[PDB]
Amino acid sequence: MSSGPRLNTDYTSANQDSRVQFIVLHYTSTDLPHSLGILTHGGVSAHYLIGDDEPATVYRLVDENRRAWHAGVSEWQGRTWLNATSIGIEIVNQGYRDTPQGRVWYPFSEAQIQALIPLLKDIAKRHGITPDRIIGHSDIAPGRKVDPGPLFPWKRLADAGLVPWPKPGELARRLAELNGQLPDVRWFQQQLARHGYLVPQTGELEKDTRDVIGAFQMKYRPARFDGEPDLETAALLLAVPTS
């Protein structure tokens, strides 16, 4: 009658979707109570935490409509600073330990994977998230972050239709395509960018490129992820789908 702003809400647009475009997977590197302490009072956070109990409890720590602080400096498919456009999922797991013999990793329990798969399907359906956008911290921050690490069972997620994975026989077919001929470093950089990685395009194999090759290997060829180009890695860069 009439002061205040008083919006007109009679019209709504058909052309809109979710602010959440990506799901990022992490491990905690620590025990469950400590993990909860860090994720609730320690300047980082995530939307979901998956415990190490059986069945594996799923804790909601941040509402999906809020920005949790899990991705940091990050890029996927040209999208930077992913916190604002992602859901973060943390899994209780020791990560790695450095030993005088070398760096060791700790496996994930079957109960955690059985909690994770239905959680991911639910999130992906509600937000329209495609398999190529369900990724690891290591994919979005190569070299800087190595979670969820070489023991994370990506193939179990792929079996459930949640992440890309070579179809049966494809790795062999692409290896046959290359026919012993290792592509140059620029080609590897081009392929990695196509899959979504931030990578240099200098044609030179420096640490910043090695780290990205290594992140891709840690996910798809975890037997060796030193970032050295080889035929098997080239073949995977061709065989791994982008959908």
Next chain:
Amino acid sequence: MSSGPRLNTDYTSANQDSRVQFIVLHYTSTDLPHSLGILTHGGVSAHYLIGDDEPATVYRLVDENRRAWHAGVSEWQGRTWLNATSIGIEIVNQGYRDTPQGRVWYPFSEAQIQALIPLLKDIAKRHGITPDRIIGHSDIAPGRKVDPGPLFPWKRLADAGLVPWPKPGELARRLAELNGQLPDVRWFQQQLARHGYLVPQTGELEKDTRDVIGAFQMKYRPARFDGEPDLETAALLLAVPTS
């Protein structure tokens, strides 16, 4: 026997904020009825539309928790693809017309600005949006987009505390520092990046850099926005505060 994944909600994180980090201003380039139409079923959308009536009606077309399709290819402060992390506000305004004497824009009405300022204060308070992140389409897509254009009254927003603006006397302080010496093009590029613009760092004044210099000029020095470096523009790059 389940209605979805079971969640434990016993705990909540102190480390979270809004997914909305930016507000982007546009004009429609068309009249009220077609603005409403296009922004509700024409393949694009925005959260708010400000009409050209008196007083000006504000329409909410997309809920703030949803992604509207207004920014397109975009970058601010290193954040790309800004739709997911922005609120878009469109203002009914014809934009510009081309004439042999040059491009001519249409002014905004008093009623529109009087509606816009309290809307911006409300959104900024609720989402914690800082003044440096209330920007124009031209800022995030320099060259490609020129809205809200040279007639948009930025200083009025600045007087309301919504956008950065030089303190009185600071432009004069900076003009004096420069002492009649025009910094080189690379210096212009470095300053523009600091302000948040996507800009080359080549030291060369080619179209891509000129378009960015011009976007900055269009906002702070709209008398001339041809993208040519000059002492006034240098002084503004120093005098306009970060944040």
